[PDB]
Structure formats: C-alpha cells, structure tokens
Amino acid sequence: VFNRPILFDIVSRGSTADLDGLLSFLLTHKKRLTDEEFREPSTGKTCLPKALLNLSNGRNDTIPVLLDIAERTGNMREFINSPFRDIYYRGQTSLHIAIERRCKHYVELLVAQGADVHAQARGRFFQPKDEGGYFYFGELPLSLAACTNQPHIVNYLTENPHKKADMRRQDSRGNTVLHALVAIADNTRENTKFVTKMYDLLLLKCSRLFPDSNLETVLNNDGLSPLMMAAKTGKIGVFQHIIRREVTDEDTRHLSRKFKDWAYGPVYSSLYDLSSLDTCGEEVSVLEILVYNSKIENRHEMLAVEPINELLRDKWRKFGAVSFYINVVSYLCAMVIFTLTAYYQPLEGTPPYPYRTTVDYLRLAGEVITLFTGVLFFFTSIKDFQLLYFIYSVLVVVSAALYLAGIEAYLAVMVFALVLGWMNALYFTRGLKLTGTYSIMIQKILFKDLFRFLLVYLLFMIGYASALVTLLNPQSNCTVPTYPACRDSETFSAFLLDLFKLTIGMGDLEMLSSILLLVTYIILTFVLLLNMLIALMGETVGQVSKESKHIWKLQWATTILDIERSFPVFLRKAFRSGEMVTVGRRWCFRVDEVNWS
Amino acid sequence: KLTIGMGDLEMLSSILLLVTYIILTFVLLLNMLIALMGETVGQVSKESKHIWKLQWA
Amino acid sequence: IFTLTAYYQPLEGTPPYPYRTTVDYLRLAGEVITLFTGVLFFFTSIKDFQLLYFIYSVLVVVSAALYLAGIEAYLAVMVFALVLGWMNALYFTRGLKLTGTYSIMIQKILF
Amino acid sequence: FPDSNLETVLNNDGLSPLMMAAKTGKIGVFQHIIRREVTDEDTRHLSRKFKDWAYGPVYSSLYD
Ligand SMILES: CC(C)C[C@H](NC(=O)c1cc2ccccc2s1)C(=O)N1CCN(C(=O)[C@H](CO)NS(=O)(=O)c2ccc(Cl)cc2Cl)CC1
C-alpha cells in the first residue's frame, strides 16, 4: 500500500477495517501481494507468516482476508509458499508456522486453499544442535507436526481431501518422519512415551496406506533406518520399544517384532524377531553399531534391552567360547615359541644364517613360526588393543629383517616385541575371572603418567645438578654423578640422572654425600613422588568401582563379536531361524521368560 | 627376584632398552600388587556379618 | 629457560659478570628473561597460589642481586626459586584433565 | 516510584540486595532474585528473566 512496516503493524494488531479498500489500491496500482517491497528483504517475511506468528490466542481472523487478496491479486500459491531467503532460517512456509503454533484452526484453511506440504525447512536454525542449529524435526510439515506433538495436525494432513504429505518422503538428510521422531527423542519419561506412541501411530498409518513395505525400512543418507539410528544416537526409550513392537490385527501384524510362540502356564516363550541385530557379517547390524560405537551414552542398558543380551549369551554358547579358548591356547603357544627363540638367540655373535644343527633347526622353526605369525598379524591389522598390535607386528617384522641382515645388537627390538606380545596377550584376558581391568588402569597410566613422572624427575635431576655446580664450585678427579665446573669437571648429567632414578626408584643407593638446601630438596622430591604415586592409586581405585559389571559385559561382547567377525559368519553358525510364511523366513530368536500372571 | 623382591640388590650394570624394561617391570608389578589389594579390599566389605556367622556356625 | 640457565650456571666460580661468548651470551639472555619475568611477577603480585608466588618473585630477585654481586655458593636460592616455580606451575593445572587436586592434598600437607 | 526500583539502593558496605544475598550465602532468595519477571509493563522494567522467542519445544530465556 504505502510501506511494509505499516502492513506488518496492522497485521500484528489484527485490524481489518484499515485493510479494506487497500486491496483495490493494490489492484489498481499494478502490485502483487508477493512483491518484494511487501516482504522484508532479509528474512523474506510476508504479512501472512507475521500474522501466523502473532496469534492472539489463535483468533487472528485477518489472515483469511490476506489470502483473499492473495488470489485476487492473481498470485496465491507462491504467496502461501513464501520461503525465507535468510541463512538463520529458510523454507519456513506458512505451513510450518501454523503447525508449530499448536493451532490447527488456520492450518486447515491454509492447506485447503493450497499450500505445499513438502516445503523443505533447510535452514541453519533447523539443523541439529551439533551442526549449528537449534531444533531439528525432519524439515517437513508432517514431521514438524509429529515431532512438535501435534497428532491432530498429522491426522488432518495425512488424510485431508486436499494434498497429503507422503510419509515416505524424506528431507535432504534422507530422514523420513520416523528418523526425525527418533532424533528428538530423549531418555526422559514423558518424551519417550509420547515419541513411542507417535512412532506406533505413524508406522501403523503408513502400513495401512501401503502394506507392501513398512516405513521403517527407508534408510537415510548415512544408511541407518530408525532402529539403528536410535541405537547409534544413544536413545533408550524409543529403542526399548522399537525392539519389542507387536501389533494385533494381521493386516498390520507383519511389522511386529516380539511375536508369541507358545505358553505352558507360567512359562512364556517370546519369539523376538531380531532380523537386524546381527547380519552374520553381510551388512550393518544393530549389535555391531551398539557395541563398537564409542558415541553411545546409554550402552549399559541398551545392551541389556533383552534380545541383545540373550543373543550375546547364545553366541557365547555356540562358537563363542571354543574360539576364545583356542585363541588363548594358540597365542600363549606363539608367545612361548617366541620367548624360547628369544632366550636361545643364536650364539657366537654375527648371526646372519647360523641355523646349522638339530636344536638350532628347531630354533629356526620357532623363529619362522614367529615371523609367519607376525606377518599374519600385520595382515589381520591392516586388511581389516589394535595399535599396540600393529606395533608388535611391525617390530617383529623389523627384527626378522635385521636378523636376515645379520646385524649385531639389533636383535634387541625383537625382545621388545616379545615383551609387547606378552603385554599384548591382555586382549584375551577380559572374559573369564572378570579380569582385564589391569588393562583399564594401565590404559589410564600410559604416556600420561610415564612422562609426568619423567618430566618431574628430569626437573629434579637438573635442579640437583645445578645445586652441585653452584654450591660445590667455590685434584678432586671428578665424581661419577656430575661434579663442579672448573678443573675440567664438566662431567655429564646422565650419571646423576640414573643415580636419582634408582636411588628414589626404591633405595639401592649410596645417597651422594654432596647440604641443607640439598637435603631439603631430596626430602621435597620424596614428598612429591609419594604424592604422585599414592594419589594416582587413589584415582585408579576411586574409578572402576570394583570393576563394575557394565565393563565386563562390554568387553565380553566385544570379544564375542571380534570372534565372529574373524571368520565368515554367514556359514551354518548363525542365530536361530523361525516361522516360514504368514508370520514370517524372518529369522527369530526365542527367549523363554516365566511369569505368574 | 630379590632385586624387585624389595631392593637388597646390586642393579647389574649391564642400557636404554634394558633400563626401560626394568622400569616396565616395576610398573607392571606395582600394578599387580596394588590392584590385587584393590580387589581384596573392595570385596569382603569390612568382612561382612554373614561371613562371621557362617564360619561360627 | 630458568631450568637451563640454572643447570648451565656460569662456570669457573666467581661469576660476577662472566658473560663472554655466544653460548654464554644466550645463557645471559635466559637469565635476563628470568629476572624480567621475576620483577613482572613482583609487580603483578603487589600491584594487584599468591603467597608462594610472591616468594618465588622475591627469591629470584635476591638471586639476581647476589649474582650481580658475584658471591659464591649464593646462586643456590636461585635453584630453590626454580624448584618453587616448578611447584608454582600448579596454579594452571586446575582445568583440563580435572587435575590439581594434588594441590589440595599438598595444601593440607604443608608445614 | 517507577523512576528507580528499590533494589538499587546500596548499603554502607555497598552491596545492594542481590550482592548481599550472594555474599551472605543465601540461595532461596538468590535463585529467585536472579529469575524475577513481572507481567505488567509499568512494573516489568524491573524484571530479569525476559523472554526472547520460542520455536515449540525450545525456549530462549533472555537473562538480564
Ligand atoms: C579364526 C578365529 C577362529 C580365531 C581368531 N584368531 C586367530 O585366527 C589367531 C591367529 C593366531 C596366530 C598365532 C597365535 C595365535 C593366534 S589366534 C580370533 O579369535 N580373532 C581374529 C580377529 N582378531 C584380531 O585380529 C585381534 C587383533 O587385535 N587378535 S589378537 O590381538 O592378535 C589376539 C589376542 C588374544 C588372543 Cl587369545 C588371540 C589373538 Cl589372535 C581377534 C579375534
């Protein structure tokens, strides 16, 4: 009419008398309700979305007049489809605003007049919290209604006489409504309950509309599908449900999981349909994602959902423990045949090719077994406790190469590879006896503590040599652990370095008699190192907390799955199958639970 | 045994690999011992009362 | 640069002004950096782990003064200021890694 | 007196109610005084926890 601000103020106030006649002025002035000057150049906001976000308790009756002007001006469809060109927002057509406002009164007329129900809200503000946004819902009006708790809006949009939003349609991320509805889910009570309810509603509706394929199958750009996405993101409330979903009516029962097999009074055989909790190495599986992935925040309970835990139990029973025990036997054997080939190292010096006699031939047999296992380990580490394992393999390879070169004092990284292989055998010791927490504590220790102690110890060595050179300098023939400066007494630090190491490495010392500063300084390092050590023991014991049960369960599962991934699982060693047709073959896992209902 | 059995040693002067290796066994045995003390103290839990009752019976 | 200027303490005894050569000039550079940081620390401590900090600053100042006086067996509070500055760096280690509780326990220990 | 809210007046030690509650160790009064919002505009200026905007289940509280 005259300027955009007055239009915005009028629509916010909701006055209709002033708007009257202005439409005639626009028509006579050759103006369109979608013209740029009517829309803010930054956000592209139009009068209609402004009214739709200024609801006076959901009774701003001006918007119908605006739509009337819109089709009168000749441009209505694009007027309803008013994408925001800014970066903070985007898309955000009238439908998103109306649906989000928890008001279906305007949504009905907005859709009926004709509004794109496939508008992509592809803006920064709509991305997940991590990717720079604030609210992620699926970038679609239907997924917006479902996520933002507007089931009535969903029912109207999916079954309106006008255009309907197909559920299978997926946003740029390839989500579909189910993926997004999983995304917003948390581990709370009300949110989880509502999300599972809407999930069941939406899945049933899609199945009824298209029984050929349930909506859950559709995979996203990352290729997860709702179940695996819930497993990866750390969801529990939605996860616990989606894995125990059963439906009554046969026409929509096929999409069930927790079938029923039979009952014998107080014993119930629930036939869980774990069709994607293990793929036998063929494809991605929910169990592998749940366990290997480190981003999981609720892995403890998620492992113990029920079918997963009993599936791991069964895997342990058949071809899960025999492999474990033969693995430890083989590894202890291949480490003993390395130990005995290390201590029996070829004699005489210069061992390029000293294998001559029967005992020496047996030593060669042991060495070749070690090298073969080393190269096999290399392949298993690159072809597929993994970095320490690559280190072991490369060290043994270097040792074998140097031995073939017959180079002196270089069969000493071979012994280091041996001792590594002896601390490398802690991979196995994570199952029986609930052992392996030594691995956790030493993992905490590593370089962190090693170089912390080493740097404080160099600190004290250097300060102490400084004390000697600054207090004692005022024929001598030099003292071994560093000495004053003149008389050609430069000496070296390393001697006092090892002296301080072993002396405060548990005594076995001479306590160099050069005093007040020096003795107080030695006392100070006593206190500091005692602190360091017992404090570190304090954190180690304070954590773990009796080694916990989640820990042992997790490493036990990891050992299982590593065992299965070792060999081709698709062979006749897979999880139990079930019913052929009608119910299914839909390989099923049968769990028996006794109840006194 | 005796040298890492609580000192009373001469520390055979043969170096880098050997000294790092001796340090490594220090760390490993200290772990073993204090970790074992950790399981022992973490269990029993002040010796419990069920225990004493059971052996008394 | 204080540790390396402590262990490389001027040789020959009687070090009033022994800075002569290139390596010794670099040692002088380190020592002057230490003294400058010490006086800056003094100002930041009086102009505004604070008492230990004033102790470090005053000890380094005393050490620099005695060195300028070239007095024997008195570049030994300088090494004490060095070791203090090495236990003085626990002010920082209270953030990442949730460390610094060593500071709390040693605070309980003290005298 | 809408010219100045009473909370501004400082004591001899110069604290004002919020800082005095913070210093003395109060929590119940402190948790409130820092999240105090008023409805009517004539007395809304003395509010702290304004409201900026909402996008459904996300609320941007504009603490003053
Ligand atoms: C084929 C399966 C029936 C058994 C398979 N193990 C082997 O084929 C062996 C090869 C050799 C060679 C010489 C001596 C002993 C063995 S055992 C197996 O079970 N897995 C293979 C994939 N895995 C791996 O690649 C990690 C790499 O980190 N294996 S490991 O670190 O080297 C290890 C650790 C403990 C034990 Cl106690 C045995 C092994 Cl190996 C683990 C799980």
List Cβ neighbours of A170 (8 Å cut-off, separation of 6 or more).
A176, A179, A218, A220
- The pairing of strands D59-63 and A258-263 is unpaired
At residue A91, φ and ψ (nearest 5 deg) are 55, -110
CA distances from A448 to A420, A444, B38, C83, C97 (A): 19, 8, 22, 21, 11
- Following CA atoms A373, A378, A379, A382 in sequence, which dihedral angle do they give, to the nearest 10 degrees? 160
Q: Under the phi-then-psi rule, with left for phi > 0, alpha for psi from -120 to 50, and beta for the rest, what region is A547?
A: left
- Dist. CA C64–CA C62, nearest whole Å: 5
- The pairing of strands D49-54 and A589-594 is unpaired
- Following CA atoms C80, C86, C87, C92 in sequence, which dihedral angle do they give, to the nearest 10 degrees? 150
Which residue minimizes the CA distance to atom 12 of ligand 1? Answer: A373
- Dist. CA C79–CA C60, nearest whole Å: 9
Tokens of A527: 């206190």
- Helices then strands, counting H and E runs in chain D, come out as 2, 2
- Dist. CA A443–CA A141, nearest whole Å: 49
Give residue A168's Cα distance to chain centre: 27
Q: Under the phi-then-psi rule, with left for phi > 0, alpha for psi from -120 to 50, and beta for the rest, what region is A513?
A: beta
Q: Residue A179 in contact with residue A224, Cβ under 8 Å?
A: yes
Measured from the Cβ of residue A285, the count of other Cβ atoms closer than 10 Å reads 19
Burial of A562 (C-beta count, 10 Å sphere; 0-12/13-18/19+): middle
Q: How many Cα atoms sit within 13 Å of A214 on the Cβ side?
A: 20
Tokens of A137: 């819902």
- Dist. CA A480–CA A549, nearest whole Å: 54
* Residue type present at position A396: V
Which residue positions of A form the known binding site? Answer: 45, 50, 54, 89-92, 101-104, 149-152, 197, 508
Q: Residue C4 in contact with residue C30, Cβ under 8 Å?
A: yes
- Helices then strands, counting H and E runs in chain A, come out as 24, 3
Measured from the Cβ of residue A519, the count of other Cβ atoms closer than 10 Å reads 11
Please name the residue ranges forming H helices in A266-386: 286-292, 299-303, 307-317, 322-343, 358-382
Sole residue written with tokens 């999300």? A195
HEC letters along chain C: CCHHHHHCCCCCCCCCCCCCCHHHHHHHHHHHHHHHHHHHHHHHHHCCCCHHHHHHHHHHHHHHHHHHHCCCCCCCHHHHHHHHHHHHHHCCCCCHHHCCHHHHHHHHHCC
The DSSP string of A214-250 is -GGG---TT--HHHHHHHHHT--HHHHHHTT---SSG
Q: Which residue of A has its CA nearest to D57?
A: A148
- Following CA atoms A522, A526, A528, A532 in sequence, which dihedral angle do they give, to the nearest 10 degrees? 150
Contacts of A102 in chain D (CB under 8 A): 56
Q: Residue A584 in contact with residue A259, Cβ under 8 Å?
A: no
Partners of D62 in beta bridges: D50
- Dist. CA A341–CA A372, nearest whole Å: 14
Give residue A223's Cα distance to chain centre: 15
Measured from the Cβ of residue A394, the count of other Cβ atoms closer than 10 Å reads 16
Partners of D60 in beta bridges: D53
Q: Which atom of ligand 1 is nearest to the CA of A562?
A: 42
Give residue A465's Cα distance to chain centre: 50
The DSSP string of A364-419 is HHHHHHHHHHHHHHHHHHHT---HHHHHHHHHHHHHHHHHHHT-TT-TTHHHHHHH
Q: Which residue of A has its CA nearest to C7?
A: A466
| Optimal mutation site among C2, C4, C7, C87, interface A, most CBs of chain A within 10 A | C7
**Is A535 within 8 Å of C102 when comparing Cβ atoms?**
yes
From A295, A296, A274, A299, select the one nearest A285 (Cα to Cα): A274
- Radius of gyration of chain C from Cα atoms? 16
Q: Which residue of B has its CA nearest to A412?
A: B17
- Dist. CA A278–CA C35, nearest whole Å: 67
Tokens of A391: 């280190």
Q: Residue C81 in contact with residue C37, Cβ under 8 Å?
A: no
Give residue A124's Cα distance to chain centre: 23
Q: Residue A204 in contact with residue A256, Cβ under 8 Å?
A: no
- Dist. CA D10–CA D4, nearest whole Å: 13
Q: Which long-range contacts (CB under 8 A, 24 or more apart) does A16-19 make?
A: A16/A61, A16/A62, A16/A65, A19/A62, A19/A65, A19/A66, A19/A69
Tokens of D48: 């702290």
Taking the alpha carbons of A473, A479, A481, A485 in that order, is the dihedral positive or negative? positive
List Cβ neighbours of A407 (8 Å cut-off, separation of 6 or more).
none
**Is A125 within 8 Å of D55 when comparing Cβ atoms?**
yes
Instruction: State the nearest Cα–Cα gap between C97 and chain A, in angstroms.
Output: 11
Taking the alpha carbons of B5, B6, B11, B15 in that order, is the dihedral positive or negative? positive
Q: Under the phi-then-psi rule, with left for phi > 0, alpha for psi from -120 to 50, and beta for the rest, what region is A176?
A: left
Which helix (DSSP H) or strand (DSSP E) does residue A468 occupy? helix A437-471
CA distances from A36 to A62, A114, A260, C87 (A): 21, 22, 62, 67
List Cβ neighbours of A586 (8 Å cut-off, separation of 6 or more).
A273, A275, A578, A579
**Is B31 within 8 Å of A441 when comparing Cβ atoms?**
yes
Give residue A306's Cα distance to chain centre: 21
Nearest to B17 among A416, A506, A540 (CB): A416
Q: Residue A82 in contact with residue A94, Cβ under 8 Å?
A: yes
Q: Residue A553 in contact with residue A246, Cβ under 8 Å?
A: no
Q: Residue A95 in contact with residue A111, Cβ under 8 Å?
A: yes
CATH no., domain A4-272: 1.25.40.20
Query: To test ligand 1's pocket by mutation, which of A292, A322, A327, A369 has the most ligand atoms within 8 angstroms of CB?
Result: A327
At residue A271, φ and ψ (nearest 5 deg) are -100, 80
Which strands form A589-594's sheet, in the order they lie side by side?
A258-263, A267-272, A589-594
**Is A134 within 8 Å of D58 when comparing Cβ atoms?**
yes
Enter the DSSP assignment of A590: E
Instruction: State the nearest Cα–Cα gap between B40 and chain A, in angstroms.
Output: 10
* Residue type present at position C80: F
- Interface A–B counts its CB contacts (< 8 A) at 41
CA distances from A93 to A240, A294, A413, A525, C111 (A): 36, 38, 68, 70, 71
Crossing angle for the helix pair A413-423 and B16-42, to the nearest 10 degrees: 10
- Radius of gyration of chain A from Cα atoms? 36
CA distances from A504 to A286, A449, B1 (A): 52, 17, 19
* Residue type present at position C24: D
Q: Residue A398 in contact with residue A413, Cβ under 8 Å?
A: yes
From B32, B45, C98, select the one nearest A437 (Cα to Cα): B32
Q: Residue A184 in contact with residue A145, Cβ under 8 Å?
A: no
Crossing angle for the helix pair B16-42 and A516-542, to the nearest 10 degrees: 50
- Dist. CA A195–CA A149, nearest whole Å: 9
The DSSP string of A9-21 is HHHHHT--TTTTT
- Supply angle C-alpha A293, A296, A300, rounded to 5: 110
Measured from the Cβ of residue A5, the count of other Cβ atoms closer than 10 Å reads 9
Resolution of the coordinates, Å: 3.7
* Residue type present at position B55: Q
Taking the alpha carbons of C40, C46, C47, C50 in that order, is the dihedral positive or negative? positive
From A216, A120, A123, A212, select the one nearest A167 (Cα to Cα): A216
Q: Residue A228 in contact with residue A218, Cβ under 8 Å?
A: no
Subunits with 3+ C-beta pairs closer than 8 A to C: A
Kindly give the distance from the C-alpha atom of residue A327 to the centroid of ligand 1, in angstroms, as a whole number.
6
Q: Which residue of A has its CA nearest to B28?
A: A442
Tokens of B41: 């103290």
From A352, A280, A358, select the one nearest A319 (Cα to Cα): A280
From A170, A197, A118, A586, select the one nearest A205 (Cα to Cα): A197
At residue A258, φ and ψ (nearest 5 deg) are -85, 80
Measured from the Cβ of residue A289, the count of other Cβ atoms closer than 10 Å reads 18
Partners of A340 in beta bridges: none
- Dist. CA A315–CA A303, nearest whole Å: 14
Enter the DSSP assignment of A198: H
- Dist. CA C42–CA A411, nearest whole Å: 56
- Radius of gyration of chain B from Cα atoms? 19
Instruction: State the nearest Cα–Cα gap between B7 and chain A, in angstroms.
Output: 6
- Dist. CA A216–CA A234, nearest whole Å: 18
From A107, A108, A75, A92, select the one nearest A40 (Cα to Cα): A92
Taking the alpha carbons of C69, C70, C71, C77 in that order, is the dihedral positive or negative? positive
From A58, A64, A66, select the one nearest A22 (Cα to Cα): A66
- Dist. CA C8–CA A462, nearest whole Å: 9
From A199, A282, A289, select the one nearest A247 (Cα to Cα): A199
- Dist. CA D38–CA D48, nearest whole Å: 9
**Is D58 within 8 Å of A125 when comparing Cβ atoms?**
no
Contacts of A148 in chain D (CB under 8 A): 56-57
CA distances from A5 to A36, A39, A80, A300, A377 (A): 13, 10, 20, 56, 73
